[PDB]
Design a protein around this nucleic acid. Structure first.
Ligand SMILES: [Mg+2]
Lengths: 227, 75, 50, 147, 227
RNA sequence: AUCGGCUCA
DNA sequence: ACGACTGAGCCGATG
């Protein structure tokens, strides 16, 4: 008995967030094995770039606020949390955001650095009202995986942090939604077959492409003790 | 003996003298060394007193007759 | 009235719907009732009780 | 080298601490209490193991033996010291003696609530489902033919 | 960033049929991914040799019986079903069983052919009573995988069969039972962690060992188009 | 520590 | 003619 080996047919880009992926051909009773197994990695795991640390001038603690600003600190921590970011080379990076005047504060108001590529240039961070004040801040971005919040980070260190360096919980995991369809494949040889279509939605910090190849690697990586 | 002690209860007879036959035996193997007979399967001196009852050994008849032995060895 | 609103957003009048299980990725052999509910984090968590 | 030196290694949350903990909890049972203790099963012993959080966990069958329920409840948690205290907590107070009830000739620890519906759903009779006229070659072929 | 890689700890042989297999350590939310995925292969796609077709002289349909025989036809179909067989070269093979007289009828009463190697030479097939009768039959053995019963073989096929050629359902999967447990494994930095124990039962035609390594190979084999 | 107040099993 | 639940929480106020 000989095993068919499934492959990639076409990637259907719909947005920088959303993408379906069609796969054929898979033998009977395998669309349920992988599609499920793939998804379980794709949510749980997967290395997306996200926000971790921030410092701001004129602020002491997160529970206080800054003048000429509609939103609160925790609110701006909260808006930073759900950011979209990309990194090319090194793992940990230090950004500088400087905006002043009337109106909103979008990410495109950060200094466009080389390795730094932003996905949403109209995302909401913060608001300003009075036109004789501004905000300067050093933000820190990192590549990790899963969810290591601020809490588990206040008990695996002893060198101590300074005052002003606030902590956002890290949303390393990029994907926000995923499913998998099980349709009947019409190959021009055999009609018994199925094909696997995996729908996904994300923040664009990792491409729809790599994501799949990167997860099935992890899957196989675990299987390497049984060959 | 971690799951259920039903075999070692009715050996001595009841559940109250599964205490003072095993308390006395859990005492003897905690102080001055004393022998571990049935393989010391990691475990501790807690189970051991009872575990000797699960393999046809420790009883009140064997703790008041063998204490005369440590009164015939120190002369 | 609720029934006649379900036929606006197109969610089965029965309220029970098909879902799929995680661990397995394998079916649930019967529609289960699902929905949106207001809950409470009322006082005394665990933190103040341990 | 002292009791106090260990008073720092404990508080430091040093790793080797939890190591010893696993072999201490190994072969050292516990008392578990619910008020009101109307009778005697209101206290029983359960050999614990470790599980992190602030919350305590328990069986859902002894639910009925205790005056108990999972909805907003609380249990104090003693520890029996002397070799005797431990072993008599195992010999008597332990849950394993308390399957039958004191007051009467019926077991108090019975399949409460959910565990039940599974078996009804399972065993429930029929005449038509998915195929029929089968035979099987033992209890094993059955499991294949389901999952 | 580095991922934990699970391994084999101990194989607990209980019989030539039954065996548990303990596995640690696996990261959070992976005992459900593999254990399930493994099982799905282990039943539906492991190529064991099993019985498919039978013909007998003096018999018309399965629901009738033969004289000088304690057991019924379906009962002998049922005893053939749960057979143990081995094949070296070709895929499909035709056996001839001829026994006569008083007492039972074990498989060792079949003609020992070259490629044909039997595992249980004291298995129960049929019984005889009166010593002036016998049984001659052409049995057919095949290598496949999973479970294609007699029912799916009478349907979506147009090649007509003759009278006397009865049909047993095929137990290709050598394995007869399997499950998987999900217990807690306790590292000195994370407590969420687990270990995978896979219970199995089988006819001994393949070892408990190879089986696992052989299936996870098949699993990975499918994954090789995405690395 | 006695009393008073108020919640949840 | 007498008799008044079993646990612990939080606050408050004067011998
Ligand atoms: Mg209640």
């Amino acid at each position: 008995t000989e095993f068919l080996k499934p492959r990639l047919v076409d990637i259907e880009q719909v947005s920088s967030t959303h993408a379906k992926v069609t796969l054929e051909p898979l033998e009977r009773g395998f669309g349920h094995t992988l599609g499920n197994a793939l998804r379980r990695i794709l949510l749980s795991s997967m290395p997306g770039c996200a926000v971790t640390e921030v410092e701001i001038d004129g602020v002491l603690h997160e529970y206080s606020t800054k003048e000429g600003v509609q939103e609160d600190i925790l609110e701006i921590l909260l808006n930073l949390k759900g950011l979209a970011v990309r990194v090319q080379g090194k793992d940990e990076v230090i950004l500088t955001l400087n905006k002043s005047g009337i109106g909103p504060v979008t990410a495109a108001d950060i200094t466009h650095d080389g390795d730094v590529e932003i996905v949403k240039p109209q995302h909401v961070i913060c608001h300003l009202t009075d036109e004789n004040a501004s905000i300067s801040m050093r933000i820190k971005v990192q590549r990790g995986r899963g969810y290591v919040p601020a809490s588990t980070r206040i008990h695996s260190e002893e060198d101590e942090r300074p005052i002003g360096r606030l902590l956002v919980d890290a949303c390393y995991s990029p994907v926000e939604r995923i499913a998998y369809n099980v349709e009947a494949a019409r190959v021009e040889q055999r009609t018994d077959l199925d094909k696997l279509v995996i729908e996904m939605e994300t923040n664009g910090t990792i491409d729809p492409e790599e994501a799949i190849r990167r997860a099935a690697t992890i899957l196989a990586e675990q299987l390497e003790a049984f060959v | 003996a971690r799951v259920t002690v039903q075999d070692a209860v009715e050996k001595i007879g009841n559940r109250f003298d599964l205490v003072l036959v095993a308390a006395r035996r859990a005492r003897q193997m905690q102080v001055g060394g004393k022998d571990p007979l049935v393989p010391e399967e990691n475990d501790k001196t807690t189970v051991i007193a009872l575990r000797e009852i699960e393999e046809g050994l420790i009883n009140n008849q064997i703790l008041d007759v063998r204490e005369r032995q440590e009164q015939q060895e120190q002369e | 009235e609720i029934k006649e609103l379900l036929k606006l957003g197109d969610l089965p009048t029965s309220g029970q719907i098909r879902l799929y299980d995680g661990r397995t990725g394998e079916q649930f052999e019967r529609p289960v009732t699902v929905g949106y509910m207001y809950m409470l984090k009322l006082n005394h968590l665990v933190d103040d009780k341990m | 080298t002292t009791i106090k030196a260990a008073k720092k290694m404990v508080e430091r949350e040093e790793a080797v601490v939890w190591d010893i903990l696993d072999e201490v909890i190994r072969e050292h049972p516990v008392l578990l209490n619910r008020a009101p203790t109307l009778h005697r099963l209101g206290i029983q012993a359960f050999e614990p193991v470790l599980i992190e959080g602030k919350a305590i966990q328990l069986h859902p069958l002894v639910c009925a033996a205790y005056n108990a329920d999972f909805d907003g409840d609380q249990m104090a948690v003693h520890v029996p010291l002397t070799l005797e205290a431990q072993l008599e907590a195992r010999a008597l107070m332990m849950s394993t003696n308390n399957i039958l009830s004191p007051a009467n000739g019926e077991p108090i620890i019975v399949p409460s609530q959910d565990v039940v519906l599974g078996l009804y759903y399972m065993t429930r009779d029929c005449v038509n489902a998915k195929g029929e006229g089968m035979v099987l070659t033992g209890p094993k072929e059955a499991e294949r033919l389901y999952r």
